[PDB]
Amino acid sequence: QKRKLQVGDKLANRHGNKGVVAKILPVEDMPHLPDGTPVDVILNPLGV
Amino acid sequence: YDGRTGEPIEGPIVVGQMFIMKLYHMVEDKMHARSTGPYSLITQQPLG
Amino acid sequence: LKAPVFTVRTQGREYGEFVLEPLERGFGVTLGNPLRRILLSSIPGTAVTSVYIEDVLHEFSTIPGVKEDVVEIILNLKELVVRFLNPSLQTVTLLLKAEGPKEVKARDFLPVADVEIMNPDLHIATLEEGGRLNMEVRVDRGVGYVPAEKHGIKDRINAIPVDAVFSPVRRVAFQVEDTRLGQRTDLDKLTLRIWTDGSVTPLEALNQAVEILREHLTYFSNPQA
Amino acid sequence: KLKAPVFTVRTQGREYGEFVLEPLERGFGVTLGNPLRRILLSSIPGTAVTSVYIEDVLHEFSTIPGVKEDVVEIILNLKELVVRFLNPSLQTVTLLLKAEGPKEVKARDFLPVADVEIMNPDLHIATLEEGGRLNMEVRVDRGVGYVPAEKHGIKDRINAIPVDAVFSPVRRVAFQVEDTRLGQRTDLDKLTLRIWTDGSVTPLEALNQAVEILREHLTYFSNPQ
Amino acid sequence: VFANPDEALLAVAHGIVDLQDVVTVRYMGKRLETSPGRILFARIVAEAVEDEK
Ligand SMILES: [Mg+2]
Numbered sequence: 001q002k003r004k005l006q007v008g009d010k011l012a013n014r015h016g017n018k019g020v021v022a023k024i025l026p027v028e029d030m031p032h033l034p035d036g037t038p039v040d041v042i043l044n045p046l047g048v
Numbered sequence: 049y050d051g052r053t054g055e056p057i058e059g060p061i062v063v064g065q066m067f068i069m070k071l072y073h074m075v076e077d078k079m080h081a082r083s084t085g086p087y088s089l090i091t092q093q094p095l096g
Numbered sequence: 097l098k099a100p101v102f103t104v105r106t107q108g109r110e111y112g113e114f115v116l117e118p119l120e121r122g123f124g125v126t127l128g129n130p131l132r133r134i135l136l137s138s139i140p141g142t143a144v145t146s147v148y149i150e151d152v153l154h155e156f157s158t159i160p161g162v163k164e165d166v167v168e169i170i171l172n173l174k175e176l177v178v179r180f181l182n183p184s185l186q187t188v189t190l191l192l193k194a195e196g197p198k199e200v201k202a203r204d205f206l207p208v209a210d211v212e213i214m215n216p217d218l219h220i221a222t223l224e225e226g227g228r229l230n231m232e233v234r235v236d237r238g239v240g241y242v243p244a245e246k247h248g249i250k251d252r253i254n255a256i257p258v259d260a261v262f263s264p265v266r267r268v269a270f271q272v273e274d275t276r277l278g279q280r281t282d283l284d285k286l287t288l289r290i291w292t293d294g295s296v297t298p299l300e301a302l303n304q305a306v307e308i309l310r311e312h313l314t315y316f317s318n319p320q321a
Numbered sequence: 322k323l324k325a326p327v328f329t330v331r332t333q334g335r336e337y338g339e340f341v342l343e344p345l346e347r348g349f350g351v352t353l354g355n356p357l358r359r360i361l362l363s364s365i366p367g368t369a370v371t372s373v374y375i376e377d378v379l380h381e382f383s384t385i386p387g388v389k390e391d392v393v394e395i396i397l398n399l400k401e402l403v404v405r406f407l408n409p410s411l412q413t414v415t416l417l418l419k420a421e422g423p424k425e426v427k428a429r430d431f432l433p434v435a436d437v438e439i440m441n442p443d444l445h446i447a448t449l450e451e452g453g454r455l456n457m458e459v460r461v462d463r464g465v466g467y468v469p470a471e472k473h474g475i476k477d478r479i480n481a482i483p484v485d486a487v488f489s490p491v492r493r494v495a496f497q498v499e500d501t502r503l504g505q506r507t508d509l510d511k512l513t514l515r516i517w518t519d520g521s522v523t524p525l526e527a528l529n530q531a532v533e534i535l536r537e538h539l540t541y542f543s544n545p546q
Numbered sequence: 547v548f549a550n551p552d553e554a555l556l557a558v559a560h561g562i563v564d565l566q567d568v569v570t571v572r573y574m575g576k577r578l579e580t581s582p583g584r585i586l587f588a589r590i591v592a593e594a595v596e597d598e599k
Pocket of ligand 1: 142174
């Protein structure tokens with residue numbers, strides 16, 4: 001079975017920051033750069 | 049910019065490119081529910 | 097404030113700039129953002145929905161003489177851009193029959209009436225001597241992103257459903273400049289930048305977006321207690 | 322696709338109302354709600370006090386002898402005045418108020434003018450003591466949005482005090498988007514729009530005007546160059 | 547100097563002042579000297595409990 005990322009799946013980076021996906025947003029709801037590029041992931045600064 | 053309103057976030061944000069991993073812990077493998085099912089031999093309590 | 101002048105600057109069928117000026121202060125975001133959201137989600141397009149490869153049962157397999165596995169081939173097909181020249185056309189089946197050795201591109205599909213491939217140079221598979229690739233790719237028309245698990249479309253038994261991303265719009269950006277008319281200096285200049293895959297021109301997408309917003313505004317009528 | 326949504330209205334009096342539109346496509350609650358809130362708060366035509374004249378008063382920060390309220394408090398009360406022009410041709414007026422102590426001056430004490438209505442005649446203006454005299458000239462204009470006094474700086478006579486112009490009849494807007502379903506569709510939106518007004522225009526009237534403003538602007542994307 | 551919280555938050559909507567700017571507002575019969583953000587917080591609590599006093 002080919003598993004796609006879904007809510008409740010666990011993501012992590014190499015620096016010990018880990019978490020589960022809680023929300024998948026449509027492309028038009030994400031914050032975007034002035035050139036129209038939307039970001040892919042939003043991380044809380046309170047974890048740092 | 050905020051994709052919902054089109055207004056900028058009131059402060060500059062740290063945006064960048066980060067390497068993130070999808071870990072082996074998936075909610076697909078962990079969600080479990082039971083109403084009734086197998087029971088133990090001696091104690092007759094539900095299995096685990 | 098008088099009626100703004102509308103200016104259009106287009107680069108081919110894939111990029112376009114649309115300028116509306118002068119506007120009242122704050123109307124750049126009032127007009128620009130609702131259009132961006134509609135452009136990025138609600139513009140109908142065409143996408144590959146199902147692929148059938150001869151002698152292939154599922155997508156977790158390889159083909160003799162073909163360098164790529166079925167999973168990689170389907171990923172290549174998801175980048176195929178197909179333009180329907182007939183507004184009433186809802187579905188098509190593109191046929192590809194290739195023998196190795198060769199680089200099979202999107203230009204290798206057999207021609208169909210009222211169907212145009214917008215990226216003929218798209219690489220699909222690499223065939224080695226003794227390899228053959230006979231497949232039927234079904235291209236449908238729709239809106240949004242429909243995963244293969246939802247539509248589950250199979251024209252035949254061994255066909256493989258493909259996740260469908262129907263949106264023809266690739267990127268949308270709008271710019272608000274500080275224009276001035278007469279003695280009023282707080283006016284807005286709105287510039288919409290639209291990137292499409294070529295099947296729909298940016299002007300066509302903008303017109304469709306405006307109609308969708310106009311149609312939704314008619315819903316604030318016939319109030320009920 | 323989805324069928325036309327249902328529009329319900331729940332209006333209490335002439336100053337508060339709730340409007341529900343549902344079901345909507347995913348994300349259209351924000352697409353419709355945000356533009357309407359912006360138009361409601363800045364584009365609905367209204368009237369406001371833009372300048373006041375008080376006999377013997379030099380600057381806004383002084384105090385009138387024989388009246389409880391100081392100049393700052395009186396100007397604050399005037400900014401709460403709701404006046405409606407019954408004539409579309411009428412652009413500006415001046416309300417005259419000559420009062421003698423020790424009465425409690427109300428908004429109803431203004432000399433009646435043709436095709437001008439005080440929506441809140443019980444509004445408290447000032448309190449006079451024995452020997453207190455209030456000779457006041459208030460200039461009411463037509464406009465939209467919020468304009469600070471230092472911006473317009475409108476003075477009819479020397480020693481006139483410009484006052485912040487609260488033109489917008491809409492006092493506050495708060496819209497809400499809820500997740501709803503229609504059968505097997507679970508990503509539908511439910512839009513609830515709540516509008517507070519000063520009473521000169523009903524919340525429904527403001528909503529209809531806001532929709533028309535957005536509808537009119539959408540027609541500007543019509544004639545390229 | 548704002549006649550009431552609604553006028554103060556209307557000015558914030560138009561970008562005249564920020565939530566953190568200290569200005570003069572008239573609220574509950576008092577000429578307070580606070581920011582629109584603190585006046586907004588007071589309204590948040592008042593509406594949640596539905597009792598302004
Ligand atoms: Mg595509």
